[PDB]
Amino acid sequence: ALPTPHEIRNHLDDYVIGQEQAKKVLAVAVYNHYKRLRNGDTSNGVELGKSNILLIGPTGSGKTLLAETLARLLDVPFTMADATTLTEAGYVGEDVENIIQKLLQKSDYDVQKAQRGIVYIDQIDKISRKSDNPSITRDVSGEGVQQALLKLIEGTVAAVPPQGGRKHPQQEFLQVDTSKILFICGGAFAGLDKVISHRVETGSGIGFGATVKAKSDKASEGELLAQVEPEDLIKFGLIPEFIGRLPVVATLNELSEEALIQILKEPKNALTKQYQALFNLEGVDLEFRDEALDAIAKKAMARKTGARGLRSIVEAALLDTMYDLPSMEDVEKVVIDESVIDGQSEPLLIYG
Amino acid sequence: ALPTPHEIRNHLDDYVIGQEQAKKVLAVAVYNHYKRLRNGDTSNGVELGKSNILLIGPTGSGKTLLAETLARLLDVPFTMADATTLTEAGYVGEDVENIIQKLLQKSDYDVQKAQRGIVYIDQIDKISRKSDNPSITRDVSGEGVQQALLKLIEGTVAAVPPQGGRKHPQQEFLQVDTSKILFICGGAFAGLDKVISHRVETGSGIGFGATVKAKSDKASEGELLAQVEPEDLIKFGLIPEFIGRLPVVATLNELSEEALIQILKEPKNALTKQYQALFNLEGVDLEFRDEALDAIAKKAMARKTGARGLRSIVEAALLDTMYDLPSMEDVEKVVIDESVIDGQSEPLLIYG
Numbered sequence: 168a169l170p171t172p173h174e175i176r177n178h179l180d181d182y183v184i185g186q187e188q189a190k191k192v193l194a195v196a197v198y199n200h201y202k203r204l205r206n207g208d209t210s211n212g213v214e215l216g217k218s219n220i221l222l223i224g225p226t227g228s229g230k231t232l233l234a235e236t237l238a239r240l241l242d243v244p245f246t247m248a249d250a251t252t253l254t255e256a257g258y259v260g261e262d263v264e265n266i267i268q269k270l271l272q273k274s275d276y277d278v279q280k281a282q283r284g285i286v287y288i289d290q291i292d293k294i295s296r297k298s299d300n301p302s303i304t305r306d307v308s309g310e311g312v313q314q315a316l317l318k319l320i321e322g323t324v325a326a327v328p329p330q331g332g333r334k335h336p337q338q339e340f341l342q343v344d345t346s347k348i349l350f351i352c353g354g355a356f357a358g359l360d361k362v363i364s365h366r367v368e369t370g371s372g373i374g375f376g377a378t379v380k381a382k383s384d385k386a387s388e389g390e391l392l393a394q395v396e397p398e399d400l401i402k403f404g405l406i407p408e409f410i411g412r413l414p415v416v417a418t419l420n421e422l423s424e425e426a427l428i429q430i431l432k433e434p435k436n437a438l439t440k441q442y443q444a445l446f447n448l449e450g451v452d453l454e455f456r457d458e459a460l461d462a463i464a465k466k467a468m469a470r471k472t473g474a475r476g477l478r479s480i481v482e483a484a485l486l487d488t489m490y491d492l493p494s495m496e497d498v499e500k501v502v503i504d505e506s507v508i509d510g511q512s513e514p515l516l517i518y519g
Numbered sequence: 520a521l522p523t524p525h526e527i528r529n530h531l532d533d534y535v536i537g538q539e540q541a542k543k544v545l546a547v548a549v550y551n552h553y554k555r556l557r558n559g560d561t562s563n564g565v566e567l568g569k570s571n572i573l574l575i576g577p578t579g580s581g582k583t584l585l586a587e588t589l590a591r592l593l594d595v596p597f598t599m600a601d602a603t604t605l606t607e608a609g610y611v612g613e614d615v616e617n618i619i620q621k622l623l624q625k626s627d628y629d630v631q632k633a634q635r636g637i638v639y640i641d642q643i644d645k646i647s648r649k650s651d652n653p654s655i656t657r658d659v660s661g662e663g664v665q666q667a668l669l670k671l672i673e674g675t676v677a678a679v680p681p682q683g684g685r686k687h688p689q690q691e692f693l694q695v696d697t698s699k700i701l702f703i704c705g706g707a708f709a710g711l712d713k714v715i716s717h718r719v720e721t722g723s724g725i726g727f728g729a730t731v732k733a734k735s736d737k738a739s740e741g742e743l744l745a746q747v748e749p750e751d752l753i754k755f756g757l758i759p760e761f762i763g764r765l766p767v768v769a770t771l772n773e774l775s776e777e778a779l780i781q782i783l784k785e786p787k788n789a790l791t792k793q794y795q796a797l798f799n800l801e802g803v804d805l806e807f808r809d810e811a812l813d814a815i816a817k818k819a820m821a822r823k824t825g826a827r828g829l830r831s832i833v834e835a836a837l838l839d840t841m842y843d844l845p846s847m848e849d850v851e852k853v854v855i856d857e858s859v860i861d862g863q864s865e866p867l868l869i870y871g
């Protein structure tokens with residue numbers, strides 16, 4: 168039998184933590200993709216639709232991580248492309264058809280197996296139209312890319328040189344349908360919080376009757392993105408014709424103080440396990456007490472960079488120890504204290 | 520015997536609703552095409568004239584749907600091209616002649632059967648200029664594409680490599696007339712409403728006598744587009760020469776509230792029938808009461824995206840059900856209430 172949403176979600180939970188609603192969206196799409204793939208116009212119903220996904224969230228929230236972990240468990244082909252390196256059908260940078268070419272490399276040029284594949288795009292915000300730009304210009308990077316992707320997300324056939332061709336002799340191209348291919352676009356949008364505030368609060372009134380902002384901190388990013396709608400993205404720069412192709416939307420909440428503590432212990436590829444393996448080959452053990460982990464959470468959130476801004480807190484601390492650890496000998500275990508993170512103390516070394 | 524406008528329309532009515540004005544235009548065109556085709560280049564009126572079509576409508580109004588349904592009932596060959604990949608002067612992206620060679624794939628390289636074919640182009644607004652000025656730089660994906668299409672829509676013979684050729688020795692091309700070929704170039708224009716508003720509004724004086732904008736919602740997109748003329752498209756960026764080749768114009772209206780309710784039940788490919796088939800294979804039925812659909816219609820128009828942005832509403836509510844439905848057993852029927860769409864309530868489930 169095929170997988171289940173609870174089973175596929177249980178697998179992603181091993182590699183991803185603190186994203187409940189986001190994992191549900193991907194499970195239903197993947198679980199539903201196998202159904203549409205298994206019965207293509209072989210049931211009472213016909214003209215089976217499609218529902219792409221648009222992932223939105225802050226930096227270091229786990230958007231790019233879900234696509235990578237999904238490829239491990241996914242059977243059908245999967246790719247991880249980008250939108251920054253695309254041009255508008257003819258310029259020197261790149262064409263949209265390169266995405267389909269990368270899919271065939273993993274599918275071994277199996278057209279029947281490539282149409283049933285999944286596609287992922289990262290950094291979609293980088294192709295967002297600048298709301299007030301000079302009218303006499305052409306946005307090949309941002310407007311052109313969206314315009315080109317319109318027919319792709321809907322379904323069409325695109326010429327793809329198989330293997331690049333030996334020489335001019337062949338001069339042929341392969342047709343690859345895209346009506347059944349899924350697309351998972353995602354990218355951290357910048358400045359979107361400001362747009363929703365103008366529409367939602369509708370205040371900022373210096374007068375008496377108008378209600379002034381109670382505090383400096385308001386409109387929580389996690390709670391603000393939840394109130395997103397397609398009309399908000401139009402003011403951002405995206406075209407409604409493009410967003411209509413991606414009905415589903417997923418709002419990822421930012422990291423929490425308790426979530427960061429679990430990311431270092433529960434996952435298998437956590438940074439603590441990475442450094443533990445870094446010293447394991449060196450014949451040296453490692454320790455990370457909970458009294459130090461909770462302290463690191465406050466340091467990371469202050470950076471406002473996300474989970475990816477955590478190595479700066481760890482490597483800045485262990486820089487001194489790693490520098491002189493190889494020269495030192497007869498050292499078996501290392502102990503990390505809360506004070507070391509603060510920088511007022513030196514980590515203890517266990518001789519042996 | 521040939522089809523009729525009433526007979527051909529009835530077939531489109533099964534797949535399209537609320538587009539009576541646009542349906543009559545395509546019926547007369549295809550009907551006149553057969554009569555124009557019945558005469559083997561000889562009639563009382565020598566050199567019969569041609570009349571192309573320019574479909575204009577909002578986003579997700581049903582333009583691409585008509586071209587797809589038309590090819591099913593149409594006997595003569597049909598193609599579904601796009602103006603996104605075209606580049607003039609033989610650039611690396613694509614050439615205009617690709618449309619012709621693509622048409623032969625459907626006709627199996629039959630010139631006499633291909634000259635009587637129909638052509639459809641989407642995203643025609645993508646190749647329009649930004650201002651009335653001629654240009655400031657070489658606009659490959661723009662006015663240059665229109666200049667190349669001028670000769671093609673009037674009539675000429677374009678070189679076409681038959682089958683691509685085995686190698687360089689063939690070095691020949693086939694000539695294919697285009698004076699008799701029909702062309703349906705239509706795409707949702709963006710920002711056209713404001714351009715037309717300046718022409719008909721007559722300005723907005725700040726004094727008493729002048730007429731100010733009554734409400735925020737005034738001069739709807741559909742009512743406004745009906746007042747479109749060729750001179751308005753010149754300020755948009757299209758050249759009058761290209762517009763002269765497209766005398767006919769079809770103004771599609773925006774989807775209404777009651778129109779969306781009919782689209783979910785009457786059409787064969789409606790979303791209600793799609794999800795009904797999605798659960799039919801799972802041995803589970805589905806229901807959608809009328810009280811739930813009226814609320815969904817109000818939510819879709821709020822998104823300002825059309826019917827294509829309807830899946831976002833249905834997928835949000837169903838998400839919870841689809842996630843735990845496979846794990847759940849002894850479940851045969853699901854009922855969706857109006858409250859479920861709002862999110863206050865949970866969809867009722869039936870066990871047995």
Ligand SMILES: Nc1ncnc2c1ncn2[C@@H]1O[C@H](COP(=O)(O)OP(=O)(O)OP(O)(O)=S)[C@@H](O)[C@H]1O
Nearest residue numbers: 183184225226227228229230231232355430474475
């Ligand atoms: N939920 C999570 N659980 C564990 N680690 C996480 C989680 N979210 C992020 N990380 C860490 O953050 C790293 C990168 O996360 P990403 O998915 O790249 O964030 P991102 O939002 O995709 O970055 P962008 O899209 O380029 S702004 C991962 O390799 C993990 O180390």
Ligand SMILES: Nc1ncnc2c1ncn2[C@@H]1O[C@H](COP(=O)(O)OP(=O)(O)OP(O)(O)=S)[C@@H](O)[C@H]1O
Nearest residue numbers: 408535536578579580581582583584707782826827
């Ligand atoms: N009149 C209609 N009746 C039923 N479904 C419709 C109708 N119009 C649009 N739809 C739905 O919208 C989908 C896409 O319609 P399209 O033909 O792509 O609209 P559109 O005018 O082409 O929008 P663009 O130009 O591609 S942005 C169809 O597959 C239907 O599901």
